[PDB]
Design a protein around this ligand. Structure first.
Ligand SMILES: Cc1cc2nc3c(=O)[nH]c(=O)nc-3n(C[C@H](O)[C@H](O)[C@H](O)COP(=O)(O)OP(=O)(O)OC[C@H]3O[C@@H](n4cnc5c(N)ncnc54)[C@H](O)[C@@H]3O)c2cc1C
Ligand code: SF4
Ligand code: SF4
Ligand code: SF4
Ligand code: SF4
Ligand code: SF4
Ligand code: SF4
Ligand code: SF4
Ligand code: SF4
Ligand code: SF4
Ligand code: SF4
Ligand code: FES
Lengths: 137, 78, 662, 84
């Protein structure tokens, strides 16, 4: 009756390329994550993550370039600081902060993208349904 | 070119086209070629099971499905 | 809004993983969708015709194509959307092939179908909120810059100049030419390497469209495809060219290259052109065939004795108090041609490079064998100056090595140049024998295999074994090379008079600094990265910057020149047009929502944001040319006063909302 | 240009669906069949369906399949053009 709802927000220049490379190489993984594709992860506002979690994302993933490998010289440092602060907010509002993570996937790491997909799915399955969906009523 | 025109236009069918393993004529399947009107027929309300037509036939193309009576064999009926 | 959804089968690549019929029916029942339809190859001419007919018939506002990746087919379907009466940017893709089919092929079909329905829903939600953009066209300055004065830089500069574009040629060293100027003879044609370069050096020095700036570096670069504001450091050469002397007022001239200055200079230092084997004064030229024959002064080693100025006399070319001058130049495109250096092979201690006298590397051997080198072209042993009679060549020295000391790649030309050096010794010293300790002879180019055949015919010994270690005889200084003859099947101990290491090559010194100034990334190997490894080996991901030569990866002089001319052509494409279109992803400030806090200003790596006066209120101002569309500022601004043109917050939030719609 | 308003070849494939001649495909190094009227593969840039005149038997089924598009001219000859 329950299937995890995981949302990914992946940059165009390394994480979308890595997911595309995994697909091209035919690396299988479970069909639980759906992606959004912004240009950089610097674009990811905090309110995007919080909006996802309040609509009912059982998990949220944000994937971007490695440090020093952003297409736009430093846009993922901003995203990293923002996601550290988001981890702190979710812990202090009492939602489980491991529902959220930020992975750094390069353009050539299709295998690592597959492993990230598998691990995110496993972690959210262990965690269970998000509590917001029943706390709203 | 495996068109099969030779198979359609040979008067005594001694040429056949088999595409995969079956006698198959795509040009007829698409109706791209006329065929010969030999127009054969034997009005069975006039034929009398005679034996002349099978006897005079230069090739082997007449079937006489008649029980074989005491002539040359055991009685077809009697 | 009225959206059309067109679902490609990709010729069973997608229909063999999901139910395209079900996806299409779901798209039909989706809100805002006017028409939903499918085709086998939406990237083909009937597919574009299908899109255009649907647009005309159903009066479509936007188009959603459920197909392969946007990185693969945005231009195709944007042009298909334009041809049909829409804006190109009323279009959005739903990647249901490389992120649904190819990853959910096996044993899971209704799950892939549900994922496809979700992706189509999110794409439709975004496209129902996209609106019209027009790409920005920016003018292109009609100059070009070439950093590097090697063969690849000189070829690119000559190509651009003869195409008519004014070109700057920046070289850090006092002369152009590069490594090929150090080469003695060239494989496989055995032509005098320096001689072939000399006409082309003269062409570069005489071309009116080339601004040859030797002994100069690139301090900083800012700008974009349109205008690159490049600041150059004109290092204090210490000597004036005739033009500069006349400008400063000395009628008698500047430097004519007589040599009296270096005849009287008392300082003596190693010559970097001769890899240190040869002396040169404090005021010097590398070799007698340098293109600007202008006699740099080495200020780190000059003692300001003033003898040089007395020798120069009325020419008055020497200014011992000269300082680093800075110049700012505006250019349209840039070509990077930084070349390479030899990997430090003293780290491989088993081959006693620095510790045994008679172990040298291949550029030192090339200078020793050249007739213009420290010797009279006579190869002699460094230990005692005697002529060798047995010479060993250690191929793969520091290459195809996964131990962390050497390089894991092949340096491409080291098998060929070792064959050349074996030939040169066997023909220059009568009775000398060349031993090549090899592990995969790689003679792949045109006439290379024939060159290999000819060297074996002249009688070089080929021992298939990587050298294990080298011991030096204590008295004769001879070198005992220990390896196994893998084909013979026995260990060997070959005693040679001279050992030559075919060392790996690595990016030049400072190349990473320069490519970070220009915004270029690096490869796995450490060389500069190209836009697409197959179909675009010259351009980089940053627009207006192009690669040429060994700086992108090791190559022979033929391949280097082909790459250099390719880069010159790519750099000429936007200059000849004079226009270039930027992608309309810019940030646009909504002024009557900006509060003027100024906090976003420091979040732009490109300094596109600033605080300015509009209607008395202090609001933020975007230099739309400098913006690159990253979105950092617009993801920061708390009040939502920054709009990202094709990835607006309402659009992204509509995608999120559509994902959670059930 | 020749006057047929309805168009020329749109790459529908009906012609090769009805052609009865079958010959090896040089694009597939001979492993695969292709009719007398054909394209090498589905991703050819001019999707215009050449006729192989060395192997066509001029049965005329292709023109009936093409219909009002009238893209097939079985009597076409080698035209010569001079370009400077
Ligand atoms: C021992 C040896 C023998 C060889 N023999 C042959 C042969 O026989 N035949 C053959 O075809 N190939 C041969 N090669 C390969 C050949 O040298 C290269 O293919 C060729 O030199 C590549 O030239 P390039 O212009 O790309 O680089 P380079 O020749 O290295 O030129 C780069 C230039 O850029 C300058 N530069 C570097 N960094 C900067 C900077 N930041 N700013 C400004 N200027 C900068 C350098 O000073 C240099 O002048 C040999 C190589 C070696 C090592
Ligand atoms: S007529 Fe018969 S032999 Fe001639 S091309 Fe057709 S099938 Fe072949
Ligand atoms: S000849 Fe043949 S068809 Fe005619 S009557 Fe006799 S059996 Fe019948
Ligand atoms: S658009 Fe993409 S999915 Fe569709 S046929 Fe072309 S390559 Fe295949
Ligand atoms: S003496 Fe003066 S003119 Fe002659 S080479 Fe030296 S600097 Fe140049
Ligand atoms: S000032 Fe003296 S040390 Fe310096 S270049 Fe002139 S002669 Fe040599
Ligand atoms: S080119 Fe030859 S010598 Fe150089 S690394 Fe490659 S295999 Fe070794
Ligand atoms: S756009 Fe936002 S961050 Fe920038 S000055 Fe205005 S209010 Fe401040
Ligand atoms: S999106 Fe914002 S931060 Fe990024 S380059 Fe443009 S103005 Fe600067
Ligand atoms: S020739 Fe006619 S039938 Fe054949 S593909 Fe072209 S338009 Fe269709
Ligand atoms: S005319 Fe030629 S191409 Fe057309 S159906 Fe007949 S054999 Fe095939
Ligand atoms: S381009 Fe991917 S994180 Fe910036």
């Amino acid at each position: 009756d329950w299937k995890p709802q995981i949302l990914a927000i992946i940059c165009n220049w390394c994480s979308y390329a890595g997911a595309d490379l995994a697909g091209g190489a035919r690396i299988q993984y479970p069909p639980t994550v759906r992606a959004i594709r912004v240009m950089c992860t610097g674009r990811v506002d905090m309110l995007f993550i919080l909006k996802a979690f309040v609509e009912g994302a059982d998990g949220v993933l944000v994937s971007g370039c490695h440090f020093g490998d952003c297409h736009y010289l430093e846009g993922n440092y901003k995203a990293a600081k923002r996601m550290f602060m988001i981890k702190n907010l979710l812990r202090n509002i009492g939602l489980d902060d491991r529902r959220f993570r930020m992975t750094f996937v390069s353009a050539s790491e299709g295998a690592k993208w597959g492993m990230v997909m598998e691990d995110v799915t496993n972690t959210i399955k262990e965690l269970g349904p998000s509590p917001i969906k029943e706390f709203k009523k | 070119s495996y068109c099969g025109v030779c198979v359609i236009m040979c008067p005594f069918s001694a040429l056949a086209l088999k595409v995969d393993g079956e006698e198959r004529l795509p040009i007829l399947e698409k109706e791209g070629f006329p065929t010969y009107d030999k127009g054969t027929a034997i009005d069975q309300d006039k034929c009398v099971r005679c034996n002349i037509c099978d006897d005079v036939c230069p090739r082997d193309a007449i079937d006489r499905d008649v029980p074989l009576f005491e002539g040359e064999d055991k009685e077809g009926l009697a | 809004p009225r959206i059309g959804v067109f679902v490609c089968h990709c010729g069973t690549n997608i229909a063999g993983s999901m139910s395209i019929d079900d996806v299409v029916n779901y798209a039909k029942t989706l809100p805002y969708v006017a028409v939903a339809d499918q085709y086998q190859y939406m990237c083909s001419t009937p597919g574009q015709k299908k899109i255009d007919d649907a647009i005309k018939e159903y009066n479509l506002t936007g188009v959603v194509v459920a197909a392969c990746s946007p990185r693969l087919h945005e231009p195709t379907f944007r042009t298909a959307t334009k041809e049909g009466g829409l804006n190109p940017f009323r279009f959005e893709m739903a990647n249901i092939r490389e992120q649904n089919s190819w990853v959910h092929m096996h044993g899971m079909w209704d799950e892939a179908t549900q994922k496809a329905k979700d992706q189509v829903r999110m794409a439709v939600a975004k496209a129902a909120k996209l609106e019209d953009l027009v790409p920005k066209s920016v003018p292109v300055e009609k100059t070009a810059m070439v950093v590097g004065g090697g063969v690849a830089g000189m070829q690119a500069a000559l190509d651009l100049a003869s195409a008519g574009i004014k070109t700057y040629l920046i070289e850090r060293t006092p002369t152009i030419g590069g490594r090929m100027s150090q080469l003695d003879k060239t494989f496989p044609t055995l032509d005098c390497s320096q001689c072939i370069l000399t006409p082309k050096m003269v062409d570069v020095g005489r071309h009116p469209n080339i601004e040859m700036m030797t002994y100069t570096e690139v301090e900083k670069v800012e700008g974009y495809i349109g205008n690159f504001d490049v600041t150059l450091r004109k290092k204090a050469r210490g000597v004036l060219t005739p033009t500069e002397a006349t400008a400063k007022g000395i009628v008698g001239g500047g430097c004519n290259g007589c040599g009296d200055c270096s005849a009287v200079c008392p300082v003596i230092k190693p010559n970097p052109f001769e890899m240190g084997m040869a002396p040169r004064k404090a005021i010097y030229i590398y070799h007698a065939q340098v293109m600007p024959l202008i006699y740099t002064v080495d200020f780190d080693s000059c003692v300001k004795c003033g003898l040089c100025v007395e020798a120069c006399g009325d020419k008055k070319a020497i200014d011992l108090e000269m300082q680093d001058e800075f110049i700012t130049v505006k250019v349209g495109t840039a070509v990077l041609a930084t070349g390479y250096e030899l990997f430090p092979i003293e780290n491989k201690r088993e081959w006693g490079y620095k510790q045994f006298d008679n172990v040298i590397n291949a550029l030192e051997f090339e200078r020793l064998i050249c007739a213009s080198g420290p010797t009279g072209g006579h190869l002699v042993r460094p230990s005692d100056g005697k002529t060798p009679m047995k010479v060993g060549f250690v191929l793969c020295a520091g290459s195809r090595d996964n131990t962390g000391i050497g390089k894991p790649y092949c340096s491409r030309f080291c098998c060929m140049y070792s064959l050349k050096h074996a030939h040169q010794i066997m023909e220059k010293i009568p009775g000398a024998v060349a031993y090549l300790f090899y592990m995969d002879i790689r003679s792949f180019g045109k006439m290379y295999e024939e060159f290999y055949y000819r060297i074996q015919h002249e009688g070089a010994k080929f021992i298939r074994g990587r050298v294990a270690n080298v011991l030096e005889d204590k008295e004769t200084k001879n070198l005992h090379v220990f390896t196994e003859d893998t084909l013979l099947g026995r260990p060997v101990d070959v005693e040679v008079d001279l050992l030559v290491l075919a060392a790996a090559v690595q990016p030049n010194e400072g190349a990473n600094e320069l490519r970070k100034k220009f915004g270029v990334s690096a490869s796995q190997d450490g060389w500069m990265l190209e836009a697409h490894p197959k179909l675009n080996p010259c351009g980089t991901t940053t627009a207006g910057v192009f690669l040429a030569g060994v700086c992108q990866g090791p190559k022979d002089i033929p391949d280097t020149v082909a790459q250099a001319e390719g880069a010159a052509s790519a750099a000429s494409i936007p200059i000849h047009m004079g226009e270039v279109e930027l992608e309309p992803y810019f940030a646009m400030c909504i002024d009557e929502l900006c509060a003027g806090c100024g906090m976003c200003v420091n979040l732009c790596p490109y300094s596109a944001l600033s605080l300015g006066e509009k209607n008395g209120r202090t609001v933020m101002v975007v230099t739309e040319a400098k913006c690159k569309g990253c979105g950092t500022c617009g993801g920061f601004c708390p009040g939502g006063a920054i709009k990202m043109q094709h990835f607006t917050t309402p659009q992204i939030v509509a995608q999120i909302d559509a994902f959670f719609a059930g």
